[PDB]
Amino acid sequence: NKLRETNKQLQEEFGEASFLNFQDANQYFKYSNKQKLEGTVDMLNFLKM
Amino acid sequence: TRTAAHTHIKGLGLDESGVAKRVEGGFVGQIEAREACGVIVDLIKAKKMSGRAILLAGGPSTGKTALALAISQELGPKVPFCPLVGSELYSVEVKKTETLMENFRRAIGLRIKETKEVYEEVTELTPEENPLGGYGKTISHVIVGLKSAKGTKTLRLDPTIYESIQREKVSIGDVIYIEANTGAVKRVGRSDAYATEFDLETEEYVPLPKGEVHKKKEIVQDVTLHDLDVANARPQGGQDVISMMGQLLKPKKTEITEKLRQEVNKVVAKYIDQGVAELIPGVLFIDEVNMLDIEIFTYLNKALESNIAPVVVLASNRGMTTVRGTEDVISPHGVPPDLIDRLLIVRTLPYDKDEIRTIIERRATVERLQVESSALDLLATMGTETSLRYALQLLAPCGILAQTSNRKEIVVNDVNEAKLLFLDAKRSTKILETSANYL
């Protein structure tokens, strides 16, 4: 559930990376959050399997 | 491009609403048997109810084996199909009943699904220390990198995987794919990136893989429980004691116990309940069942009331014979009456002159040969006079004789000479009874 919340965090972060060059252009910390969120949720899906 | 009395039978040739025409699927005549067997195909395809048996009876050269092959073709290449003969049940390694049980388990298959995430040149590798204990030395972490094609990516892991890849004997600059499920990694080879590193080499060039750093693929596997329980019973491994011993043990199959059967049944039951596995019942074929024995027949009854019994089909041509093993039991087709009570009987009938002539036409057509009308008409004459199979086999020598005198078609005198050259059973036994020189 926490990692699904990180999926939602990615969505609010930038449109599933849609608004990267227009919204997240001047902020790189949120970029490094977005790289972690989806990767870790997929890894936790693997952990649930 | 070769055939052996078959492979011209393409299915059963049964239309919708269960009807069979005259010429279809390389099949002619015997409509009712085809209807019944198509109904059997429908019952198997239902995959609801299992444990039945069906025996079909008839004379020689009737098409029983053709009927079974038509069944197998109609079912398709997904459901397992295990043809067999009575003699192969006997063995010098295990019991007859046991071998029947391996075949029984081999008949039914199971399709399983599973997804796998795999990571796939190698940028670098580096371990990370004080063990804070009595251990000699270790690395806190290991950081590596993979190049691939769709961008590169670094990777942090445990010195166990570092040890495993070291055992794989892989160069620092190389292509590597690593399994995320357990960590097993094998040397893919020398990647194409470091081509012509020296003038002469031997390692494979291994073009760099085109894909993401990590790739997920869907795998669907179709196996039978017979593979499952032998895999469970047989040991595996590397240098461990039982591993070398089994490597030198000559692994003869010996008397699989029922405990494995119960365990695998429980595991597959919970897996299909989970919904990851689907069980596909198969059909097992025993040709020429008259060669079996009383013990096999009784254990066949017992296995026929079993839980996971696949549908089996039996073939025979015997009549009011005595079943092997005993002498006081005269039963039809050499099958004990108690077994006969436990299955159905499908009748088959001999063909006529017209049907034999049509068979000859079909068989000539499939082998890309030309037959003169009169020659084919006479071929039907001793097809009925002697046998269908004699005239069926006669065709190829006639074609050779036609090749001798440079003529594609087949003429009357060619087949007459062929008949003169090669004798039939009746003429041969006539010569045998006439002579007295041990012939």
Binding site: - | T97, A233, T254, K270, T298, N307, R318, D341, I345, T384
Partner: protein, 443 residues
């Protein structure tokens, strides 16, 4: 819940339709008729769960298709779990890697079950932190933790060596035997759950245990006698229960382990349970096996043995005389016979209806009556097989119900055993005789 079954030849049989004073109900759980046989089976069952007298031989007779195996299935379902029930036919006793007597002995030891109780004390998932040290014999005292409980424990040189093998960060939770055993890794905590970009098959993230780590829990253990002998047959023989190479264990483990189980029973920590060994298709067997059974009935650990057969007076496998019932008179002398009569028309109707509803087949009344008439003419198994094919052909005609004409088409499609015999009689020349004679030339 664990029914991987598609169907069974008799899956409607779930126990016996009895009551407090063991009165057979007219119809209950896929069972109809033969009330005397059912009452006898219930008496034998109550005897079995009495579990106070062993070595009883009971024989079930009857014609073919009379349902003698139905009673065995019913009693097996009635006893259910906690009691072994070995269903063995007469043909698997013939092994060329094992003496028939040895196979019978293995079967007899299989049918007896023994349960034991054992209690283990262990601290689970509490090793928190390692404080290595002055130098040498370090980490002599480290704390333990759970989600709800913590304690500091001192460690000696022997425990230091034990921890040295497969050393862990101790920030995880690990279970170690407080009963002077060894250590067992449990996994990793949540703190390092996000520390690897790739996974293996050695350590998996483990939860911090709830409650006190220390726990002295008792475990019951159930196993049959055959397994308990084969486990002591060699240095290690756990594969023998799987591979099947018992190897004709010599008669030294058997008596010593009988003494061991007697000692365990006197200690009260082990309880025996006499199961039931059922042998179908007994009329084929060797006289040596019959004599061995004759003796083995007298053993103290002799499970209840039930036999099934259908042949009348016939030759026995191993002699030259037509003994009655297919068995030697000595075996018949020390056994109990439960005969089963034939089946009736109303019973035929009920059985066919039960079979039809078992495979969720909608049946017209007239079709059911035609099936009953045929099952009066021929065997009942004939109609019990034709029901499914009639349903299939009715489906092919796109009508959900099984109309009469569909049943008639199914009957005309498949030959009766008697009909097949008659047709063979009409066409003897066409088929191949027992003398190798056959005719294929039509003209």
């Amino acid at each position: 819940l664990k029914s991987l079954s598609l169907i069974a030849a008799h899956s409607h049989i779930t126990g016996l339709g009895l009551d407090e004073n063991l009165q057979p109900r007219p119809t209950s759980e896929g069972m109809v008729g033969q009330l005397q046989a059912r009452r006898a089976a219930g008496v034998i069952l109550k005897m079995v769960q009495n579990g106070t007298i062993a070595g009883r031989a009971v024989l079930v007779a009857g014609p073919p298709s009379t349902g003698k195996t139905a009673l065995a299935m019913g009693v097996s379902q009635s006893l259910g779990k906690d009691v072994p029930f070995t269903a063995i036919a007469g043909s698997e006793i013939f092994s060329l890697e094992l003496s028939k007597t040895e196979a019978l002995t293995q079967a007899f030891r299989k049918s007896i079950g023994i349960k034991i109780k054992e209690e283990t004390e262990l601290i689970e998932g509490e090793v928190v932190e390692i404080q290595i040290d002055t130098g040498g014999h370090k980490q002599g005292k480290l704390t333990i933790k759970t989600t709800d409980m913590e304690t500091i424990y001192e460690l000696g040189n022997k425990m230091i060596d034990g921890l040295t093998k497969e050393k862990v960060l101790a920030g995880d939770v690990i279970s170690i035997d407080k009963a002077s055993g060894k250590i067992t890794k449990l996994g990793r905590s949540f703190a390092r759950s996000r520390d690897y970009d790739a996974m293996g098959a050695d350590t998996r993230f483990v939860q911090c245990p709830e409650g006190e780590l220390q726990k002295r829990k008792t475990v019951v253990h159930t196993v049959s006698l055959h397994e308990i002998d084969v486990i002591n047959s060699r240095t290690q023989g756990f594969l023998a229960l799987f591979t099947g190479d018992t190897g004709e264990i010599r008669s030294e483990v058997r008596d010593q382990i009988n003494t061991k189980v007697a000692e365990w029973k006197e200690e009260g920590k082990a309880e025996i349970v006499p199961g039931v060994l059922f042998i179908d298709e007994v009329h084929m067997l060797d006289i040596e096996c019959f004599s061995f059974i004759n003796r083995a009935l007298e053993d103290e650990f002799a499970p209840i043995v039930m036999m099934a057969t259908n042949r009348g007076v016939s030759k026995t496998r191993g002699t030259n005389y037509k003994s009655p019932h297919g068995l030697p008179l000595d075996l018949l002398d020390r056994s109990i016979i439960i005969t089963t009569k034939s089946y009736n028309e109303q019973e035929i109707k009920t059985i066919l209806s039960i079979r039809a509803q078992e495979e969720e087949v909608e049946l017209s009344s007239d079709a059911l009556d035609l099936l009953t008439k045929t099952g009066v003419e021929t065997s009942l198994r004939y109609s019990s097989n034709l029901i499914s094919v009639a349903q299939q052909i009715a489906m092919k005609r796109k009508n959900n119900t099984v109309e009469v004409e569909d049943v008639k088409r199914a009957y005309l499609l498949f030959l009766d055993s008697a009909r097949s015999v008659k047709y063979v009689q009409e066409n003897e020349s066409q088929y191949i005789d027992d003398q190798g004679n056959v005719q294929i030339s039509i003209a």
